[PDB]
Amino acid sequence: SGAIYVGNYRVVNRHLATHNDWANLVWEDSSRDLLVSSTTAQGCDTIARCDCQTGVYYCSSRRKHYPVSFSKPSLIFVEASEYYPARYQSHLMLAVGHSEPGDCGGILRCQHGVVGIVSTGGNGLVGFADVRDLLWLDE
Ligand SMILES: CSc1ccc(C2CC2)cc1CC(=O)N1CCC[C@H](C(N)=O)C1
Ligand SMILES: [Zn+2]
Secondary structure, eight states: OOOEEEEEEEEEEGGGOOHHHHHTEEEEETTTTEEEEEEEEEEEOOBOOSOOOEEEEEETTTTEEEEEEBOOSEEEEEOOOSSSOSEEEEEEEEEESOOOGGGTTOEEEETTEEEEEEEEEETTEEEEEEOTTOGGGTO
16 A cells, blocks of 8 residues: 655555545556546645656565665566556566565655655566656646
8 A cells, every 4th residue: 555645636556546536536547557636635745857766665564665776667567467457567667676465555765756656566576656757746
Protein backbone atom coordinates (compact mmCIF):
# COMPACT_ATOMS: atom_id res chain seq x y z
CA SER A 1 0.00 0.00 0.00
CA GLY A 2 0.87 3.73 -0.44
CA ALA A 3 -0.24 6.89 -2.28
CA ILE A 4 1.12 10.31 -3.55
CA TYR A 5 -0.83 13.35 -2.33
CA VAL A 6 -0.20 16.43 -4.51
CA GLY A 7 -2.77 19.28 -4.44
CA ASN A 8 -6.29 17.96 -5.14
CA TYR A 9 -4.93 14.59 -6.39
CA ARG A 10 -4.24 11.09 -4.99
CA VAL A 11 -1.86 8.91 -7.05
CA VAL A 12 -2.09 5.14 -6.37
CA ASN A 13 -1.35 1.80 -8.14
CA ARG A 14 -4.21 1.07 -10.49
CA HIS A 15 -4.36 -2.53 -9.20
CA LEU A 16 -4.74 -1.30 -5.55
CA ALA A 17 -7.44 1.39 -6.31
CA THR A 18 -10.54 1.71 -4.01
CA HIS A 19 -14.24 2.66 -4.65
CA ASN A 20 -13.55 6.33 -3.82
CA ASP A 21 -10.72 6.44 -6.36
CA TRP A 22 -12.98 5.04 -9.14
CA ALA A 23 -16.00 7.24 -8.12
CA ASN A 24 -13.66 10.36 -8.42
CA LEU A 25 -11.47 9.22 -11.36
CA VAL A 26 -9.41 11.91 -13.08
CA TRP A 27 -7.10 9.57 -15.14
CA GLU A 28 -6.07 5.89 -15.05
CA ASP A 29 -3.62 3.80 -17.17
CA SER A 30 -3.35 -0.05 -16.97
CA SER A 31 -0.03 -0.08 -18.92
CA ARG A 32 1.52 2.28 -16.32
CA ASP A 33 -0.35 0.75 -13.29
CA LEU A 34 -1.35 4.36 -12.32
CA LEU A 35 -4.65 5.81 -11.25
CA VAL A 36 -5.19 9.44 -10.18
CA SER A 37 -8.36 10.39 -8.27
CA SER A 38 -9.92 13.58 -6.73
CA THR A 39 -9.59 14.74 -3.08
CA THR A 40 -11.11 17.71 -1.22
CA ALA A 41 -8.01 18.23 0.98
CA GLN A 42 -4.94 20.06 -0.48
CA GLY A 43 -1.97 17.56 -0.55
CA CYS A 44 1.63 18.71 -0.13
CA ASP A 45 3.97 16.19 -1.83
CA THR A 46 6.36 17.88 -4.27
CA ILE A 47 6.66 15.95 -7.57
CA ALA A 48 10.15 15.93 -9.08
CA ARG A 49 10.60 17.34 -12.61
CA CYS A 50 13.99 15.76 -13.47
CA ASP A 51 15.98 12.78 -14.97
CA CYS A 52 17.53 11.52 -11.73
CA GLN A 53 18.83 7.96 -11.64
CA THR A 54 19.60 7.74 -7.87
CA GLY A 55 17.02 8.08 -5.13
CA VAL A 56 15.56 6.61 -1.90
CA TYR A 57 12.51 4.29 -1.77
CA TYR A 58 10.31 3.07 1.12
CA CYS A 59 10.17 -0.73 1.70
CA SER A 60 7.22 -1.59 4.10
CA SER A 61 8.19 -5.33 4.11
CA ARG A 62 11.50 -4.31 5.83
CA ARG A 63 10.22 -1.05 7.56
CA LYS A 64 13.16 0.73 5.96
CA HIS A 65 14.11 3.39 3.42
CA TYR A 66 16.75 2.33 0.89
CA PRO A 67 19.03 4.22 -1.45
CA VAL A 68 18.73 2.94 -5.11
CA SER A 69 20.30 3.50 -8.48
CA PHE A 70 17.37 3.15 -10.87
CA SER A 71 16.86 2.94 -14.64
CA LYS A 72 15.22 5.35 -17.12
CA PRO A 73 11.45 4.96 -17.76
CA SER A 74 10.91 2.11 -20.23
CA LEU A 75 8.57 -0.66 -21.59
CA ILE A 76 9.68 -3.55 -19.34
CA PHE A 77 7.82 -6.88 -19.56
CA VAL A 78 5.92 -7.83 -16.37
CA GLU A 79 4.83 -11.51 -16.06
CA ALA A 80 1.07 -12.22 -15.78
CA SER A 81 -0.55 -11.72 -12.32
CA GLU A 82 -4.01 -11.69 -10.55
CA TYR A 83 -4.48 -8.03 -11.55
CA TYR A 84 -3.13 -7.97 -15.14
CA PRO A 85 -2.33 -10.44 -17.97
CA ALA A 86 1.29 -10.82 -19.26
CA ARG A 87 2.40 -7.52 -20.80
CA TYR A 88 5.00 -4.73 -21.10
CA GLN A 89 4.44 -2.01 -18.54
CA SER A 90 5.35 1.45 -19.88
CA HIS A 91 7.15 4.17 -17.79
CA LEU A 92 8.72 1.59 -15.46
CA MET A 93 12.11 1.99 -13.78
CA LEU A 94 14.07 -0.91 -12.29
CA ALA A 95 16.56 -1.09 -9.41
CA VAL A 96 18.59 -3.74 -7.52
CA GLY A 97 16.88 -3.76 -4.10
CA HIS A 98 14.42 -5.65 -1.88
CA SER A 99 10.73 -5.85 -2.93
CA GLU A 100 7.62 -7.94 -1.83
CA PRO A 101 3.91 -7.87 -3.13
CA GLY A 102 2.74 -5.70 -0.21
CA ASP A 103 5.45 -3.15 -1.06
CA CYS A 104 3.48 -1.61 -4.01
CA GLY A 105 2.73 2.06 -3.33
CA GLY A 106 5.94 2.95 -1.49
CA ILE A 107 7.28 6.31 -2.59
CA LEU A 108 10.63 6.83 -4.47
CA ARG A 109 12.31 10.24 -3.90
CA CYS A 110 15.34 12.19 -5.11
CA GLN A 111 16.62 15.70 -4.07
CA HIS A 112 13.96 17.19 -6.48
CA GLY A 113 11.05 15.38 -4.80
CA VAL A 114 8.76 12.46 -5.63
CA VAL A 115 9.87 10.31 -8.61
CA GLY A 116 7.31 7.45 -8.48
CA ILE A 117 5.86 4.52 -6.54
CA VAL A 118 6.83 0.83 -6.12
CA SER A 119 4.96 -1.09 -8.83
CA THR A 120 6.77 -4.35 -9.68
CA GLY A 121 9.71 -6.41 -8.29
CA GLY A 122 11.19 -9.81 -7.71
CA ASN A 123 14.44 -11.80 -8.02
CA GLY A 124 16.41 -9.14 -6.13
CA LEU A 125 14.91 -6.24 -8.18
CA VAL A 126 12.19 -3.53 -7.54
CA GLY A 127 10.26 -1.60 -10.21
CA PHE A 128 8.87 2.01 -9.88
CA ALA A 129 5.90 3.55 -11.69
CA ASP A 130 7.27 6.92 -12.86
CA VAL A 131 5.12 10.11 -12.38
CA ARG A 132 7.66 12.90 -13.31
CA ASP A 133 6.07 13.31 -16.79
CA LEU A 134 2.54 13.98 -15.37
CA LEU A 135 2.94 17.80 -15.42
CA TRP A 136 -0.83 18.33 -14.78
CA LEU A 137 -0.50 17.07 -11.17
CA ASP A 138 0.85 20.53 -10.13
CA GLU A 139 -1.55 22.66 -12.18
C1 LIG B 1 6.50 -4.91 -5.47
S1 LIG B 1 5.39 -6.07 -6.24
C2 LIG B 1 6.34 -7.55 -6.35
C3 LIG B 1 7.53 -7.69 -5.63
C4 LIG B 1 8.14 -8.93 -5.53
C5 LIG B 1 7.60 -10.04 -6.16
C6 LIG B 1 8.12 -11.44 -5.90
C7 LIG B 1 9.53 -11.82 -6.23
C8 LIG B 1 8.42 -12.37 -7.04
C9 LIG B 1 6.48 -9.87 -6.96
C10 LIG B 1 5.82 -8.65 -7.05
C11 LIG B 1 4.51 -8.69 -7.80
C12 LIG B 1 4.46 -7.79 -9.02
O1 LIG B 1 5.48 -7.38 -9.56
N1 LIG B 1 3.23 -7.51 -9.52
C13 LIG B 1 1.96 -7.96 -8.91
C14 LIG B 1 0.97 -6.81 -8.79
C15 LIG B 1 0.83 -6.09 -10.13
C16 LIG B 1 2.19 -5.58 -10.62
C17 LIG B 1 2.06 -4.76 -11.90
N2 LIG B 1 2.30 -3.47 -11.79
O2 LIG B 1 1.76 -5.30 -12.97
C18 LIG B 1 3.08 -6.82 -10.80
ZN1 LIG C 1 15.50 14.46 -9.30
